[PDB]
Amino acid sequence: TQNVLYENQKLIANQFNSAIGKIQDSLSSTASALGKLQDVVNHNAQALNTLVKQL
Amino acid sequence: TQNVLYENQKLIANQFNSAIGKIQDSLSSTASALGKLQDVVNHNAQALNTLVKQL
């Protein structure tokens, strides 16, 4: 019975670790996307500002 | 005692599955928001470029 309990513990730990890996991937992807959006937003803000200053 | 161990394992599994469902919700919402931001940023970039070209 103790072996069964230890095997259930290993199951839970394996599933949890896989979930954590997926969540880490999602965090990194969200960070990447936010960074790209920040870059483009600020670039286009500077581009509207330049247009105003050159009109 | 072994029954306390097995019920604890079931509790752990149920709480884990609940958390995973909530995390899936959060992931879908994040993707939706990033998609809307992408669409609007590109729309406004194209609008600014069309303005520049029309002048």
Binding site: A33 | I20, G35, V52
Partner: peptide
């Protein structure tokens, strides 16, 4: 004075894929 477009479709697709794949991490 050119405006740039953003392309984060990779990140969006991966987020949706994980939102689907987490079903596989559920404990039976």
């Amino acid at each position: 004075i050119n405006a740039s477009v953003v392309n984060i479709q990779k990140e969006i697709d991966r987020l949706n894929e994980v939102a689907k794949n987490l079903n596989e991490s559920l404990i039976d």
